[PDB]
Amino acid sequence: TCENVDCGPGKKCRMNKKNKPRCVCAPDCSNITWKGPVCGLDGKTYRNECALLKARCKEQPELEVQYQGKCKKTCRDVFCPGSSTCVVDQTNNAYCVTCNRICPEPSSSEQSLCGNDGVTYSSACHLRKATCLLGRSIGLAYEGKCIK
Amino acid sequence: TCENVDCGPGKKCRMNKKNKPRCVCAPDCSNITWKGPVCGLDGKTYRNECALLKARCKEQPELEVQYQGKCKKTCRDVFCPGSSTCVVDQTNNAYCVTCNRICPEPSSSEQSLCGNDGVTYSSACHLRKATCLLGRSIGLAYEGKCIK
Amino acid sequence: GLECDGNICCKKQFFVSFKDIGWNDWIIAPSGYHANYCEGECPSLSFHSTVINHYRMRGHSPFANLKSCCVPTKLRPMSMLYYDDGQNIIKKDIQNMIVEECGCS
Amino acid sequence: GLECDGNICCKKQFFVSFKDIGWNDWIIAPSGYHANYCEGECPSLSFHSTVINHYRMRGHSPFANLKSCCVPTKLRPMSMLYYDDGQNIIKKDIQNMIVEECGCS
Ligand code: NI
Ligand code: NI
Ligand code: NI
Ligand code: NI
Ligand code: NI
Ligand code: NI
């Protein structure tokens, strides 16, 4: 009893352990161009893009390849696709992202922040922008303008 | 602005950090008979029953005193109230509970179980009953009747 | 405005007995509890509710036409002792067991 | 019977943009996602739903008159990178971010 069941693209019906009809993941892996390992947006290395597509169907609907090859520590050996650029997170894992560049200019200094780099940023947006663009956390030294 | 706010029994209105009116826990602790520490149903020792009543209002609506004094390991020094009796859990913490005594008798042996005690129990209900009554896990040796 | 009164969205205090349900031999303690539930008419938020709520704003495009309803907005844990698969006695503090507050989603 | 069609309880695919919402500088990645939502009419379960559902049975006493509604019955996680309070870059796999299935409670 699956003859009649239709589960749409990406999926197929299959008889389970207790005889019942179930829909299971079955993505199209028939023309993947890159044949090697891939690094998912979850920071996990997949054996190939087919394994990533099955995980996407099964567990993480927005999981995508963020770059080709195994997931890396540091941005040294990472090539980001398109206009994306590399950052590292809290444990030094590389991620390919598109950094925001638009920050409204505040009309006072109450939003000012002092980065660990000794630089005074006009707002959180400005510090976050320099951070993404640098490639790694700078971090907040304290709120307010840096003290001279 | 709390003059007008009424939050029912167990609670009072109090002005918070950002000036807004809020309802906060305030149970009646004015005639607690037992003055000492108590062991909550969560397995936590409370300084007194008032501290337990505030936790009940704040975080665990069914939290109750399960016995007086600090929570104990082993049932050796525990006095259970009423018709309740003592069992220990997985890490040897004492709990006062009311053991179920009613088990339907199965009409076959397919439900049979072999306990770690070498005893054949007619069903899971029967093993659970002996367990609660013993005071500590016996555990399943394997499904089916014990092999002679 | 939870505890139900005279008929909107509100919390109904409600006791379930594990014996009624048939779980009194599996659950050692407690014997039942005020699980509660939400009843009535709908004329802090999770991240998902928060992002979707933005597109529910009058006149928004695209527009999320979300089926609004009286659901729990606050839940509380309860401790329980029960038998696991090896028929061992286990205690846990289980989250989300009790409905504490109800509201229109 | 989720993906919405022609009007019962069903999952509506729906994309939210963190830029639309004003969180594009706080959330580094992704830039938006299909959060989805549930729409439509209501004419596996948590423990709470399971115990209450017993008292919803036709003719049951006591009776839980639960305000039934089209809500998510299945959710999925999504990875995200964002700035924490120290403005450090953090990655997490966040649970319950996406509505995957909808059903009448
Ligand atoms: Ni019943
Ligand atoms: Ni109760
Ligand atoms: Ni209440
Ligand atoms: Ni908008
Ligand atoms: Ni998407
Ligand atoms: Ni779907």
PDB file of all heavy atoms in Angstrom, chain A residues 38-40 42-46 66-67 69-73 94:
ATOM      1  N   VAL A  38      32.151  18.742   1.108  1.00  0.00           N
ATOM      2  CA  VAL A  38      31.649  20.104   1.098  1.00  0.00           C
ATOM      3  C   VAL A  38      31.468  20.535   2.558  1.00  0.00           C
ATOM      4  O   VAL A  38      31.301  19.681   3.444  1.00  0.00           O
ATOM      5  CB  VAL A  38      30.258  20.265   0.381  1.00  0.00           C
ATOM      6  CG1 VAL A  38      30.335  20.092  -1.205  1.00  0.00           C
ATOM      7  CG2 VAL A  38      29.159  19.371   1.032  1.00  0.00           C
ATOM      8  N   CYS A  39      31.461  21.844   2.792  1.00  0.00           N
ATOM      9  CA  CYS A  39      31.316  22.320   4.175  1.00  0.00           C
ATOM     10  C   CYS A  39      29.931  22.934   4.241  1.00  0.00           C
ATOM     11  O   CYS A  39      29.625  23.846   3.481  1.00  0.00           O
ATOM     12  CB  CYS A  39      32.392  23.361   4.477  1.00  0.00           C
ATOM     13  SG  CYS A  39      32.229  24.007   6.188  1.00  0.00           S
ATOM     14  N   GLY A  40      29.066  22.398   5.100  1.00  0.00           N
ATOM     15  CA  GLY A  40      27.725  22.914   5.192  1.00  0.00           C
ATOM     16  C   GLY A  40      27.673  24.193   6.008  1.00  0.00           C
ATOM     17  O   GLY A  40      28.570  24.482   6.771  1.00  0.00           O
ATOM     18  N   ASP A  42      26.008  24.488   8.546  1.00  0.00           N
ATOM     19  CA  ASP A  42      26.036  24.066   9.949  1.00  0.00           C
ATOM     20  C   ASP A  42      27.453  23.861  10.509  1.00  0.00           C
ATOM     21  O   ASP A  42      27.599  23.475  11.685  1.00  0.00           O
ATOM     22  CB  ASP A  42      25.225  22.787  10.165  1.00  0.00           C
ATOM     23  CG  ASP A  42      25.641  21.652   9.219  1.00  0.00           C
ATOM     24  OD1 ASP A  42      26.567  21.886   8.374  1.00  0.00           O
ATOM     25  OD2 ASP A  42      25.079  20.525   9.252  1.00  0.00           O
ATOM     26  N   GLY A  43      28.485  24.125   9.688  1.00  0.00           N
ATOM     27  CA  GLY A  43      29.863  23.916  10.108  1.00  0.00           C
ATOM     28  C   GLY A  43      30.250  22.446  10.116  1.00  0.00           C
ATOM     29  O   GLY A  43      31.275  22.082  10.708  1.00  0.00           O
ATOM     30  N   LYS A  44      29.468  21.589   9.439  1.00  0.00           N
ATOM     31  CA  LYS A  44      29.821  20.169   9.400  1.00  0.00           C
ATOM     32  C   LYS A  44      30.368  19.833   8.032  1.00  0.00           C
ATOM     33  O   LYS A  44      29.859  20.329   7.015  1.00  0.00           O
ATOM     34  CB  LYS A  44      28.613  19.261   9.690  1.00  0.00           C
ATOM     35  CG  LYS A  44      28.968  17.759   9.499  1.00  0.00           C
ATOM     36  CD  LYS A  44      27.799  16.778   9.758  1.00  0.00           C
ATOM     37  CE  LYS A  44      28.193  15.318   9.465  1.00  0.00           C
ATOM     38  NZ  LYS A  44      28.628  14.974   8.050  1.00  0.00           N
ATOM     39  N   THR A  45      31.373  18.985   7.990  1.00  0.00           N
ATOM     40  CA  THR A  45      31.906  18.513   6.681  1.00  0.00           C
ATOM     41  C   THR A  45      31.044  17.380   6.189  1.00  0.00           C
ATOM     42  O   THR A  45      30.767  16.472   6.950  1.00  0.00           O
ATOM     43  CB  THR A  45      33.363  18.037   6.831  1.00  0.00           C
ATOM     44  OG1 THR A  45      34.184  19.180   7.022  1.00  0.00           O
ATOM     45  CG2 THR A  45      33.962  17.351   5.467  1.00  0.00           C
ATOM     46  N   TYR A  46      30.579  17.443   4.939  1.00  0.00           N
ATOM     47  CA  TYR A  46      29.860  16.304   4.349  1.00  0.00           C
ATOM     48  C   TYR A  46      30.767  15.584   3.271  1.00  0.00           C
ATOM     49  O   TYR A  46      31.551  16.243   2.581  1.00  0.00           O
ATOM     50  CB  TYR A  46      28.521  16.754   3.710  1.00  0.00           C
ATOM     51  CG  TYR A  46      27.530  17.224   4.785  1.00  0.00           C
ATOM     52  CD1 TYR A  46      27.655  18.481   5.364  1.00  0.00           C
ATOM     53  CD2 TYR A  46      26.584  16.349   5.309  1.00  0.00           C
ATOM     54  CE1 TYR A  46      26.770  18.906   6.362  1.00  0.00           C
ATOM     55  CE2 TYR A  46      25.706  16.742   6.345  1.00  0.00           C
ATOM     56  CZ  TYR A  46      25.819  18.014   6.863  1.00  0.00           C
ATOM     57  OH  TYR A  46      24.961  18.394   7.858  1.00  0.00           O
ATOM     58  N   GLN A  66      28.407  25.978   2.048  1.00  0.00           N
ATOM     59  CA  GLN A  66      28.862  27.387   2.175  1.00  0.00           C
ATOM     60  C   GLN A  66      30.209  27.528   1.500  1.00  0.00           C
ATOM     61  O   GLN A  66      30.600  28.636   1.065  1.00  0.00           O
ATOM     62  CB  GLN A  66      28.944  27.838   3.649  1.00  0.00           C
ATOM     63  CG  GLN A  66      29.894  26.996   4.505  1.00  0.00           C
ATOM     64  CD  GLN A  66      30.203  27.709   5.836  1.00  0.00           C
ATOM     65  OE1 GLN A  66      30.361  28.937   5.875  1.00  0.00           O
ATOM     66  NE2 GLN A  66      30.334  26.928   6.900  1.00  0.00           N
ATOM     67  N   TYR A  67      30.947  26.412   1.435  1.00  0.00           N
ATOM     68  CA  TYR A  67      32.139  26.355   0.548  1.00  0.00           C
ATOM     69  C   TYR A  67      32.556  24.922   0.245  1.00  0.00           C
ATOM     70  O   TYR A  67      32.175  23.999   0.946  1.00  0.00           O
ATOM     71  CB  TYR A  67      33.357  27.124   1.087  1.00  0.00           C
ATOM     72  CG  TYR A  67      33.810  26.823   2.542  1.00  0.00           C
ATOM     73  CD1 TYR A  67      34.801  25.864   2.817  1.00  0.00           C
ATOM     74  CD2 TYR A  67      33.273  27.544   3.621  1.00  0.00           C
ATOM     75  CE1 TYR A  67      35.239  25.629   4.133  1.00  0.00           C
ATOM     76  CE2 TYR A  67      33.690  27.312   4.930  1.00  0.00           C
ATOM     77  CZ  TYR A  67      34.687  26.380   5.180  1.00  0.00           C
ATOM     78  OH  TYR A  67      35.098  26.190   6.490  1.00  0.00           O
ATOM     79  N   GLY A  69      35.097  21.541  -0.321  1.00  0.00           N
ATOM     80  CA  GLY A  69      36.176  20.978   0.475  1.00  0.00           C
ATOM     81  C   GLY A  69      35.701  20.771   1.908  1.00  0.00           C
ATOM     82  O   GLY A  69      34.566  21.115   2.236  1.00  0.00           O
ATOM     83  N   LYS A  70      36.561  20.268   2.784  1.00  0.00           N
ATOM     84  CA  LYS A  70      36.174  20.054   4.176  1.00  0.00           C
ATOM     85  C   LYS A  70      36.061  21.420   4.887  1.00  0.00           C
ATOM     86  O   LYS A  70      36.715  22.384   4.466  1.00  0.00           O
ATOM     87  CB  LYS A  70      37.232  19.201   4.892  1.00  0.00           C
ATOM     88  CG  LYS A  70      37.551  17.846   4.136  1.00  0.00           C
ATOM     89  CD  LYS A  70      38.565  16.938   4.932  1.00  0.00           C
ATOM     90  CE  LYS A  70      38.908  15.637   4.122  1.00  0.00           C
ATOM     91  NZ  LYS A  70      40.158  14.917   4.676  1.00  0.00           N
ATOM     92  N   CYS A  71      35.294  21.459   5.984  1.00  0.00           N
ATOM     93  CA  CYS A  71      35.209  22.660   6.836  1.00  0.00           C
ATOM     94  C   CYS A  71      36.587  22.868   7.429  1.00  0.00           C
ATOM     95  O   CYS A  71      37.314  21.884   7.705  1.00  0.00           O
ATOM     96  CB  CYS A  71      34.161  22.470   7.954  1.00  0.00           C
ATOM     97  SG  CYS A  71      32.479  22.342   7.325  1.00  0.00           S
ATOM     98  N   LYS A  72      36.972  24.135   7.577  1.00  0.00           N
ATOM     99  CA  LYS A  72      38.346  24.469   7.923  1.00  0.00           C
ATOM    100  C   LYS A  72      38.350  25.315   9.197  1.00  0.00           C
ATOM    101  O   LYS A  72      37.343  25.904   9.552  1.00  0.00           O
ATOM    102  CB  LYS A  72      39.003  25.297   6.762  1.00  0.00           C
ATOM    103  CG  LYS A  72      39.231  24.581   5.382  1.00  0.00           C
ATOM    104  CD  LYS A  72      40.247  23.517   5.528  1.00  0.00           C
ATOM    105  CE  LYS A  72      40.952  23.195   4.184  1.00  0.00           C
ATOM    106  NZ  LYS A  72      40.070  23.439   3.014  1.00  0.00           N
ATOM    107  N   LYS A  73      39.498  25.337   9.879  1.00  0.00           N
ATOM    108  CA  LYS A  73      39.806  26.252  10.949  1.00  0.00           C
ATOM    109  C   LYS A  73      40.702  27.315  10.329  1.00  0.00           C
ATOM    110  O   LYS A  73      41.620  27.008   9.526  1.00  0.00           O
ATOM    111  CB  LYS A  73      40.648  25.563  12.055  1.00  0.00           C
ATOM    112  CG  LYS A  73      40.011  24.371  12.706  1.00  0.00           C
ATOM    113  CD  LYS A  73      38.811  24.754  13.495  1.00  0.00           C
ATOM    114  CE  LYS A  73      38.723  23.808  14.703  1.00  0.00           C
ATOM    115  NZ  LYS A  73      37.333  23.718  15.180  1.00  0.00           N
ATOM    116  N   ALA A  94      35.911  28.388  10.118  1.00  0.00           N
ATOM    117  CA  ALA A  94      35.693  29.344   9.018  1.00  0.00           C
ATOM    118  C   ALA A  94      34.288  29.274   8.436  1.00  0.00           C
ATOM    119  O   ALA A  94      33.765  28.178   8.236  1.00  0.00           O
ATOM    120  CB  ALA A  94      36.752  29.168   7.910  1.00  0.00           C
TER     121      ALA A  94
END
